[PDB]
């Protein structure tokens, strides 16, 4: 069971350590420039 | 009317536990099976 | 009690998430909507001047378009409380004949408040075409409809209240309810305006994503990449897109994850004034510039034409 | 069960119209109702029941109510699928009690409205079928139980025949069967004459065109006629009924309401109205040349409307005509059919499309019942062969309902035994719709102009009327070249004005 076996394993662990952190109901920065950035490339290292 | 009655309160009192453990993680396995209560109770949630 | 529980749910809409000044495809039945939400400001007007006021207003579109958002629009205009009525309430499935009852006490506290609106999304769920259900489902159906047909039938008794229903096409709905007098007017909105596309896009870019990136992305191509689209994803275009820019590049998950979670402690405690301090704004371009993520213009020309 | 006792019902047989034969048959129950009593003194057993059969909206409650207003008798009105219950019994009863309330005023009139509700067949293709059994025999015990003598008079309407018992049907308990025909065009002259006097009129207004071009409306659809024409006038804030809105109601309610800027591309509706103008200039020339006995164009529309994008309308001709279907009449029909095809491979040449592939359908079908199910040729057949694929008479599009229908054998089939008389019989049909399809193509081929600038027309009016392609047709005689045509400024320019 290397990493690239599975990819919908991998999103699950993600979600539900987000969940554990407390990673979700801070859904938002709305900040000026950087912690924007670091949220959408976040985003997107989540799903894909 | 008594079945309706029974079933809402059922079905408030597994949300409202559920809300009261939170963090939590719910498990609703055959959702085939679905009536409309549960479906309104749903929808609203 | 389901009619006094959907009461309970009684909303003043003020500030509409699209507003009919930027809602798209209604120019050219706009007339139609200014006389029905002058009716429904002032309904002593159109009792007064005689006309028929219209009863009812039907929207017909596709499922996302924006029609609840069109229909709160048109209520904010009005300045007019509305209740959301949802389907399930309507059709209480265990003695045959609680649905004219139901929408009998509907009507009666609406004609309390009136002017108000009866909000009721998916009509042609429950109130369709007579005949397509044979099991035991045409009775109720029918005491639905006659119920439904005769308290919009109220003879000249014009107190303001006004029911919109939402379908989605405009062939499934009964003949019955079709004529004027019962259901007066009929909105179709299928697909916006490639400049009003543009005109929602910018919006979109100007009030979600980066002021800063706004220029680097020409947005009529990315109008023609969302042709097939509705105003809301009109309006969740961009993160998406600004995400799928940051796709391009190598990065890791953990250094990110640790980035958000060192600035989801620290941003609860830091002021305001600390943020807009130029120490603040300098601090994250050399944050970003030493962990590399600048988004650049071809970057995201790159993304806009790999899309579909 | 709150049974309306009326003294007087408002309705009079004034307000009956074109259910003559029915209303003078019952005539005889109006009389029986009025004085019984030269009714016993002969010897008369009045009918138990009277069943009023016949299409919805045909107003047979009406007529029971205008017998119970003449004669001045109370009216118990309480439908059939007022029977119907949960608890088992309850029916019964309320029958029991609807009809002892009946015998405590004689004579009195017993009305059950959808009487097929309560007295479904047992077809052989929860406990409320049992309630209705139940119901049924107590409503048959009181009706074979009636005395005669006391004149209580019950009246059954129903809109099926085939679902309902044949035990009712029994004399001694439906004594008397009336069908309630669709009115006639006298019968919905008249009534367009009562409702139109509810609402305000126009001179301009000719409501025998109307009564003559609406064949087999009910009258309740008569008052929707002129409700949706009320409804249109209101909408257009006409102080009455013009004749235009009475023809917008006319083709809101035929073939549906115009929809708004949905067009296809050019070529998509180029092929549309080719076929639709091929089609109605195949109708025209035959009328005109071999003098056919077949319909007239009315008006050709390329504008969607309903599920229609496309749409030629062709009048109804009279009934008479429409039982001995000779044979020339079947062929030029059948040219008709094909006109569309021929359309297509006179103006495309050779590259035809599926616009067309109904009319070759229905050509294909009616070659086999000329064929097979009417034996009209002089090789005799043993067998007919129901059609594999069955579409229904409808509107404006061709009438394929001159033998009453197209696709409705009557029952002139048999499983056939040899196999190769079938391809004779195929063969056959091959030669009759080839032949036919050389001659319609060779007929409209001999005119491109007429069909080249009707079209042109149509395209730039988005519709056309019978007395523009006429006056087309006489404007472009046959063999005129089409640089004729083609040295026009404008081909799609109409100088007449209607």
């Given at each position: 069971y290397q990493m690239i076996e599975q990819p919908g394993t991998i999103y699950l662990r993600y979600l539900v350590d987000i969940h554990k952190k407390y990673l979700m109901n801070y859904e938002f920065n709305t900040s000026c420039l950087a912690e924007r950035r670091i949220f959408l490339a976040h985003y997107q290292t989540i799903t894909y | 009317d008594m079945m309706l009655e029974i079933d809402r309160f059922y079905i408030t009192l597994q949300f409202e536990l559920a809300k009261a453990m939170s963090p939590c993680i719910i498990w609703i396995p055959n959702i085939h099976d679905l009536s409309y209560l549960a479906l309104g109770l749903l929808v609203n949630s | 009690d389901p009619i006094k529980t959907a009461f309970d749910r009684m909303k003043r809409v003020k500030n509409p998430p699209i507003p009919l000044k930027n809602f798209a495809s209604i120019e050219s039945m706009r007339e139609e909507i200014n006389e029905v939400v002058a009716f429904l400001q002032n309904p002593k007007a159109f009792q007064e001047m005689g006309a028929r006021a219209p009863r009812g207003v039907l929207i017909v579109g596709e499922r996302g378009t924006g029609k609840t958002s069109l229909a709160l629009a048109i209520a904010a205009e009005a300045r007019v409380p509305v209740v959301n009525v949802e389907a399930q309430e309507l059709e209480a499935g265990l003695w045959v004949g609680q649905s004219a009852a139901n929408v009998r006490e509907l009507f009666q506290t609406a004609r309390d408040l009136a002017p108000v609106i009866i909000f009721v999304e998916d009509f042609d769920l429950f109130a369709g075409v007579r005949g397509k259900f044979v099991h035991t489902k045409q009775q109720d159906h029918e005491s639905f409809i006659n119920q439904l047909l005769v308290e919009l039938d109220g003879f000249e008794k014009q107190d303001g209240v006004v029911l919109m229903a939402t379908t989605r096409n405009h062939k499934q709905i009964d003949e019955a309810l079709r004529r004027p007098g019962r259901m007066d007017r009929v909105f179709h909105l299928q697909s916006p305006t490639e400049m009003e596309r543009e005109r929602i896009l910018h919006n979109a870019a100007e009030e979600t994503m980066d002021r800063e990136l706004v220029d680097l992305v020409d947005w009529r191509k990315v109008s023609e990449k969302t042709t097939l689209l509705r105003p809301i994803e009109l309006k969740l275009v961009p993160m998406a897109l600004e995400s799928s820019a940051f796709r391009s590049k190598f990065l890791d998950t953990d250094e990110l994850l640790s980035y958000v979670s060192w600035f989801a402690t620290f941003s609860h405690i830091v002021p305001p004034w600390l943020r807009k301090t130029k120490v603040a704004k300098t601090m994250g371009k050399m944050l970003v510039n030493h962990l590399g993520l600048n988004l650049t213009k071809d970057d995201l020309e790159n993304v806009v034409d790999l899309m579909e | 069960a709150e049974a309306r006792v009326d003294g007087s019902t408002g309705v009079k047989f004034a307000d009956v119209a074109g259910i003559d034969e029915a209303v003078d048959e019952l005539q005889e129950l109006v009389k029986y109702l009025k004085n019984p009593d030269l009714f016993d003194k002969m010897g008369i057993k009045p009918p138990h029941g009277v069943l009023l059969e016949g299409p919805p909206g045909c107003g047979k409650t009406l007529v029971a109510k205008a017998i119970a207003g003449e004669a001045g008798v109370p009216f118990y009105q309480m439908a059939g699928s007022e029977f119907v219950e949960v608890l088992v019994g309850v029916g019964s009863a309320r029958i029991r009690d609807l009809f002892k309330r009946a015998k405590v005023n004689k004579p009195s009139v017993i009305f059950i409205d959808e009487i097929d509700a309560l007295a479904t067949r047992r077809q052989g293709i929860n406990a409320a079928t049992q309630e209705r059994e139940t119901t049924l025999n107590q409503l048959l015990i009181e009706l074979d139980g009636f005395d005669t003598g006391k004149g209580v008079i019950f009246l059954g309407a129903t809109n099926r025949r085939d679902l309902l018992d044949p035990a009712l049907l029994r004399p001694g308990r439906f004594d008397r069967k009336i069908r309630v025909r669709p009115p006639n065009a006298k019968g919905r002259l008249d009534i367009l004459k009562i409702h139109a006097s509810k609402v305000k009129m126009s001179d301009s207004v000719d409501l025998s065109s109307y009564a003559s071009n609406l064949p087999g409306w009910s009258g309740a659809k008569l008052a929707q006629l002129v409700q949706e024409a009320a409804l249109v006038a209101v909408r257009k804030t006409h102080n009455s009924?013009?004749?235009?809105?009475?023809?917008?109601?006319?083709?809101?309610?035929?073939?549906?309401?115009?929809?708004?800027?949905?067009?296809?591309?050019?070529?998509?509706?180029?092929?549309?109205?080719?076929?639709?103008?091929?089609?109605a200039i195949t109708s025209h020339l035959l009328l005109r040349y071999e003098n056919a006995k077949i319909e007239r164009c009315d008006r050709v529309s390329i504008i969607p409307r309903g599920q229609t994008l496309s749409q030629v309308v062709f009048h109804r001709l009279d009934d008479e005509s429409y039982m001995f279907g000779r044979l020339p009449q079947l062929l030029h029909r059948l040219q008709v059919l094909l006109g569309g095809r021929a359309a297509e491979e006179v103006i495309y040449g050779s590259d035809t499309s599926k616009a067309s592939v109904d009319y070759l359908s229905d050509a294909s079908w009616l070659a086999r019942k000329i064929l097979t199910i009417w034996n009209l040729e002089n090789p005799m057949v043993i067998h007919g062969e129901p059609p594999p694929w069955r579409k229904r008479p409808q509107f404006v599009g061709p009438r394929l309902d001159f033998e009453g229908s197209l696709y409705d054998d009557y029952d002139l089939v048999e499983p056939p035994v040899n196999f190769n008389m079938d391809d004779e019989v195929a063969h056959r049909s091959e030669e009759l719709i080839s032949q036919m399809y050389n001659k319609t193509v060779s007929l409209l081929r001999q005119n491109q102009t007429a069909l080249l600038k009707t079209v042109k027309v149509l395209l730039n009016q988005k519709e056309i009327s019978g007395e523009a392609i006429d006056f087309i047709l006489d404007h472009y005689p046959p063999q005129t070249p089409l640089n004729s045509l083609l040295q026009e400024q404008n081909p799609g320019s109409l100088p007449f004005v209607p």
């Amino acid at each position: 069971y290397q990493m690239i076996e599975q990819p919908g394993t991998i999103y699950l662990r993600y979600l539900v350590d987000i969940h554990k952190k407390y990673l979700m109901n801070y859904e938002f920065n709305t900040s000026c420039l950087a912690e924007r950035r670091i949220f959408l490339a976040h985003y997107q290292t989540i799903t894909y | 009317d008594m079945m309706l009655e029974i079933d809402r309160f059922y079905i408030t009192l597994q949300f409202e536990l559920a809300k009261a453990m939170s963090p939590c993680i719910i498990w609703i396995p055959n959702i085939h099976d679905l009536s409309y209560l549960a479906l309104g109770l749903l929808v609203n949630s | 009690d389901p009619i006094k529980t959907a009461f309970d749910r009684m909303k003043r809409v003020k500030n509409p998430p699209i507003p009919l000044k930027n809602f798209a495809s209604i120019e050219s039945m706009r007339e139609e909507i200014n006389e029905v939400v002058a009716f429904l400001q002032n309904p002593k007007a159109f009792q007064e001047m005689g006309a028929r006021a219209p009863r009812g207003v039907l929207i017909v579109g596709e499922r996302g378009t924006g029609k609840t958002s069109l229909a709160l629009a048109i209520a904010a205009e009005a300045r007019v409380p509305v209740v959301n009525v949802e389907a399930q309430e309507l059709e209480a499935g265990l003695w045959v004949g609680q649905s004219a009852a139901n929408v009998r006490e509907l009507f009666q506290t609406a004609r309390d408040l009136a002017p108000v609106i009866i909000f009721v999304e998916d009509f042609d769920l429950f109130a369709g075409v007579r005949g397509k259900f044979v099991h035991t489902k045409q009775q109720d159906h029918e005491s639905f409809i006659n119920q439904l047909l005769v308290e919009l039938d109220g003879f000249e008794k014009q107190d303001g209240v006004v029911l919109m229903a939402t379908t989605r096409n405009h062939k499934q709905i009964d003949e019955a309810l079709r004529r004027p007098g019962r259901m007066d007017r009929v909105f179709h909105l299928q697909s916006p305006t490639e400049m009003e596309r543009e005109r929602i896009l910018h919006n979109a870019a100007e009030e979600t994503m980066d002021r800063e990136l706004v220029d680097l992305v020409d947005w009529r191509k990315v109008s023609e990449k969302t042709t097939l689209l509705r105003p809301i994803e009109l309006k969740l275009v961009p993160m998406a897109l600004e995400s799928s820019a940051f796709r391009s590049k190598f990065l890791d998950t953990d250094e990110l994850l640790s980035y958000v979670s060192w600035f989801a402690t620290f941003s609860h405690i830091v002021p305001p004034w600390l943020r807009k301090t130029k120490v603040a704004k300098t601090m994250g371009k050399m944050l970003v510039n030493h962990l590399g993520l600048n988004l650049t213009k071809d970057d995201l020309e790159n993304v806009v034409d790999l899309m579909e | 069960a709150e049974a309306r006792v009326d003294g007087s019902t408002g309705v009079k047989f004034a307000d009956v119209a074109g259910i003559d034969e029915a209303v003078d048959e019952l005539q005889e129950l109006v009389k029986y109702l009025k004085n019984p009593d030269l009714f016993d003194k002969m010897g008369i057993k009045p009918p138990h029941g009277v069943l009023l059969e016949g299409p919805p909206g045909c107003g047979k409650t009406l007529v029971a109510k205008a017998i119970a207003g003449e004669a001045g008798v109370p009216f118990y009105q309480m439908a059939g699928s007022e029977f119907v219950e949960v608890l088992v019994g309850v029916g019964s009863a309320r029958i029991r009690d609807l009809f002892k309330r009946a015998k405590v005023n004689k004579p009195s009139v017993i009305f059950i409205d959808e009487i097929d509700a309560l007295a479904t067949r047992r077809q052989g293709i929860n406990a409320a079928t049992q309630e209705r059994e139940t119901t049924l025999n107590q409503l048959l015990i009181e009706l074979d139980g009636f005395d005669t003598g006391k004149g209580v008079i019950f009246l059954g309407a129903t809109n099926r025949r085939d679902l309902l018992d044949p035990a009712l049907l029994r004399p001694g308990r439906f004594d008397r069967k009336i069908r309630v025909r669709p009115p006639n065009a006298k019968g919905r002259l008249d009534i367009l004459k009562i409702h139109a006097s509810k609402v305000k009129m126009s001179d301009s207004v000719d409501l025998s065109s109307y009564a003559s071009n609406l064949p087999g409306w009910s009258g309740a659809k008569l008052a929707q006629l002129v409700q949706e024409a009320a409804l249109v006038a209101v909408r257009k804030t006409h102080n009455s009924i013009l004749q235009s809105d009475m023809d917008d109601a006319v083709d809101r309610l035929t073939v549906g309401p115009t929809r708004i800027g949905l067009e296809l591309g050019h070529q998509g509706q180029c092929r549309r109205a080719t076929t639709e103008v091929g089609v109605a200039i195949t109708s025209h020339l035959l009328l005109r040349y071999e003098n056919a006995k077949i319909e007239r164009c009315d008006r050709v529309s390329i504008i969607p409307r309903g599920q229609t994008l496309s749409q030629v309308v062709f009048h109804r001709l009279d009934d008479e005509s429409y039982m001995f279907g000779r044979l020339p009449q079947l062929l030029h029909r059948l040219q008709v059919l094909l006109g569309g095809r021929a359309a297509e491979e006179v103006i495309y040449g050779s590259d035809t499309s599926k616009a067309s592939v109904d009319y070759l359908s229905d050509a294909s079908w009616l070659a086999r019942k000329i064929l097979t199910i009417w034996n009209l040729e002089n090789p005799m057949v043993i067998h007919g062969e129901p059609p594999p694929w069955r579409k229904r008479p409808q509107f404006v599009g061709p009438r394929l309902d001159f033998e009453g229908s197209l696709y409705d054998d009557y029952d002139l089939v048999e499983p056939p035994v040899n196999f190769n008389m079938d391809d004779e019989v195929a063969h056959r049909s091959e030669e009759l719709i080839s032949q036919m399809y050389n001659k319609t193509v060779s007929l409209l081929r001999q005119n491109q102009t007429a069909l080249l600038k009707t079209v042109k027309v149509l395209l730039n009016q988005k519709e056309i009327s019978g007395e523009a392609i006429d006056f087309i047709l006489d404007h472009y005689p046959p063999q005129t070249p089409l640089n004729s045509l083609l040295q026009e400024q404008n081909p799609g320019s109409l100088p007449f004005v209607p």
